[model samples]
Target chain A: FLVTRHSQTTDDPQCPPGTKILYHGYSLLYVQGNERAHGQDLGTAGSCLRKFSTMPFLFCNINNVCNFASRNDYSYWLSTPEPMPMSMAPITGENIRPFISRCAVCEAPAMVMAVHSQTIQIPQCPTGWSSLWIGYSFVMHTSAGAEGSGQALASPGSCLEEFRSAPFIECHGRGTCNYYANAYSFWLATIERSEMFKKPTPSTLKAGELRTHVSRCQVCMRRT
Target chain B: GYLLVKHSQTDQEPMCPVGMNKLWSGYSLLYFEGQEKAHNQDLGLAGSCLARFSTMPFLYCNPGDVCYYASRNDKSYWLSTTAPLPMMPVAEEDIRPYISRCSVCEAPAVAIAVHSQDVSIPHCPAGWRSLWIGYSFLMHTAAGDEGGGQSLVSPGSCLEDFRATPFIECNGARGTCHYYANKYSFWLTTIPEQSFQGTPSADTLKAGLIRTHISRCQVCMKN
Candidate 1:
């Protein structure tokens, strides 16, 4: 069992040695009816989840590029959220450094987050692990300033080739149904013998068929 | 602590003991009729089992992806997210398909894979321990696609040691290396980098000089 002490007089610089970071992605702040795109900043209490980056971006699926759960598996999480702000400054041409504004703020709601999570294929979880958000993982497109180039390789060469994965959540019943980025995503697996979810462009892929790139995931926990 | 996966022996699904949690569930292809071939989609077309695993895990061992085969077995020690389990049954002894799974726990731990030719597993220097050992297709490279293949990959723990082989061996043969597996494990989730197998455009660089199928060992450490 473990507990993260937020009220501590001295903040520990690192996550406890016994546990690791479960999720390092951003959690959108509740924007109640256009209230300046803001919500509760949980950092005022304990510091389980720390807000690292802040930016402005729409959570939609236009051209299949919107707020596809900005999940950073490695440093992608630590990566500074690129702003859509002043992106208008770009096509004014690449001749100068571009600075965008109105960037979205995908803050980490420390209050609602636990330190670790594990994905699995079981009806439930074991001892210390929790079945917090048991749902299917979805990915539909590429990324920029994110995980991969968000580009599909024509014909990948080996293990983990042109492999790119983005964060997705089960958006049913939640009413965020309109927030889905795209329905098509790359399926994953090891060849039975050895495999994509490999998005080999439209010339090779079928837009309507469900390409089942697999793997079941599970959420986990460690508490008293 | 950073963390890790291992294969099992039996076809029966393996459980993630009380302290652990799972990440994925699926099987890995090790070889063909007799050839120790690298697992890939090119072979999925000829069999049913491969079809079952299509659109799956590091299973996406696309071209240029590194294949880690250090420690493998046929146990189902993973977590399944959806229903009607996309479980792949164990084939007969004639075909050696290793059913694999990955899991994680809130408890901190770290896993490291070292490519060694001298042993089945690596030495657990100091606080480090063992999780499971596996083999890797030698794919070490030098400085940039975005570099890192050459950067010192040390532990997130206390120790600060670097007494190992370089990713690229240039003792005259002048070649590059890559881990052969496309995506690394989720826990030790790899850094996003280019597959530049070291310096490119230089026609002299060749692979295969280093032992391709070196004994891969994934050791662990605790606080």
Candidate 2:
């Protein structure tokens, strides 16, 4: 319960020195309409959830990316007007082609937004590029969702590669759905893990991590 | 975008607290005991959690937007808006201390409001004590005082303070700086003086230096 006041006003004349901004590619996920609540896990959304959990990874992405996939571990389970829909349907990997193509042309360094209702406006890549992708995924179940242990790597240089990564539902499971931005280097044939949401630990993320927690079983919203 | 605030609550459903609408405009005297909407709507704090309407308290102003407010007592913490404000980010573990003064020699307070300039869990009220901006990725709190300058924390870099690169740090050894013009980096520099000076060509200045500078830094990784 720490409450303190800053003397300087928001419009102080003498601006302090500025720091260098760190920039790169970013992703945004938005949950529109009914899924908005499921999208924003009571403000405990985004990288905040990982704050309290153990570390190897601390913050996910700095930019306002991960609006949808964030629900995996950090999200708020809000009190909405109605209960979420619980419908389990299998969406395929080939279906992801459209999204992959879309990601390739993203312009601005932004995040993929997952909206609650389908009507929500999808964000476009910077300027010259076209397309905005709202990924659809399910919560992963047991047995590594689809693949088994000791999964083989792509080849000599490649370590691990899911020709089509397991669906979100399979990776995270029941109460959550997932989404991500893939950063790949062709020659390397190596896929680097950027950011993903998994089982959220309450104590770790606090409220910020409560933004995008969704239940795949609760078919309130699905894009497959 | 502006005047983001933070409040503790029991309900997990996420509702705005009552009397929050008055917070939008600036500090208001009416917020002392809280007010009921048109039909005496006693929806309570949670009900006031998220409100969007005309004649609200907060206003959206760009970098040049001006704000004015007055404070007198302890309960004087009032924002001049009725709209539902976006909550601040949370990173409990990384949470830093809010800049508070020595309670015994406490100083008089002044204006405070959350804006993109200083994104915090919630914007500190104008008169409340300043705390270290939370180090969380988003919602980095920033506030300052009238007399002594209070430390205002921000995420990554504060753009206003950004200026033209003084001198290129050539890799001396390589004697080369690689540069490219695809998008984000290409448009990094802007010139308000579009007169005869004309636009600087990305090709004119070899981005080799810029590219080389950005290449090794993990944070500046480009797509």
Candidate 3:
């Protein structure tokens, strides 16, 4: 058995009879990137922000034999340079439009930012019509050193509920064909929200110079 | 008379000539966990689009592997010995076309159709097509598509072309429509397309498992 949480406790819990306890840390991120003529442009200078997280994890096994471990890769804080940013940065502070909570794990505080942005209303197919198609837009990033995750959702309340659902949240990075059953039917779906650790570039091309940190949010898709 | 028939039936049960059921019947109850997909609901489309951030294992087998299933279609003859191939679409424009041409049958085509809304589900487009390529099953029952449900509109053309067959037209008028091989669910449309005259091969069946909720309130609240 295994368990995880953002905060840590001062003491560890005892294992069950004839069982052992294991502890560790884990961090997963979902990011989207921009297309480029050659390779992708992560984030620009000053624009590259960073984050820092100090959380612990715990794992338990019936016997220390099979030996289980998670994919949480990070440098334990024994010794280090000035100190590394916890996670990624340029804090997704509270700003602009509606809050986007559903994507908090990937894009937190759920707000969008860009220069010359345009709004487009996408259509829902197969499932036919729906109210989830709220609004979509493209942002502009013109500054040279100003870079970060380029595009973001301006709406927050729209997906807060989905973000909180079971199987959905726990299965985020795990290859569990996350299933969801509504009043109608059951389905096997996947959440494609990974990206380069760098910043982004806009979708459209600019006049003479190219936009630095730009990205676009088209549509989400299912897994095979 | 009843006692004699029962004894005869027990003798007729087919046995694995090579070994016990565990040998050829090696199965894995893989767990596929992830944040729900943002678009199309069909297992194939979502698998490709959101595979990077999400993790889920559908099914796969090593070489010389064969599962079991009971069927009257006599479709086992059509299955390919190889694993189903996955199709990748570079852009939205290439989605349907890619799915149409893929010869592999393990998973669905990658070019799934995602809804424009947040709460919407994913699905194959109207003309998008999927075939009952050959594979194996491990069940003792036979299933089929709704004969009158999703039939072919065109008879002899490249029926596999997703752009031409759109699911809207292939799934006939009314009733529960399913791809007997893929077992994908689809609402039958009134329109018809080039009907699938060929019987589905049993090996093409998708092997998925069931998941139980850990707890009623274990859900994540992103806010």
TM-score of each: 0.21, 0.16, 0.16
DockQ of every candidate: 0.01, 0.01, 0.01
Show model 1 residue runs off by greater than 4 Å.
A1-224, B1-3, B9-18, B23-107, B139-213
Residue-wise lDDT of candidate 3 within B1-223, one digit each (tens)?
0000000011122132121121111111111211111112221211221211111223222243532111000111001111222221122232222122111112221222222111112233455543211111111111122111111121111111111112211111111111122222222221112444355333231223211100001101011
> Which residue ranges in model 3 land beyond 4 Å of their true spot?
A1-224, B1-14, B17-23, B28-223
Model 1 error, position B141 (Å): 16
Candidate 1's residue-wise lDDT over A82-103, tens digit each? 3323321111122211211111
The per-prediction CA RMSD against the true structure, in angstroms, equals 27.5, 27.2, 25.3
Model 1 global lDDT (CA atoms, 0 to 1): 0.25
User: What is the alpha-carbon interface RMSD for each candidate?
Assistant: 23.0, 23.5, 23.8
lDDT of 1 by residue, B18-125 (tens): 465654433422221101112221111111122133111222121434332211110111111112221222223312222322222233654454433343345666
Model 2 residue runs over 4 Å out of place are A1-170, A175-186, A189-224, B1-223
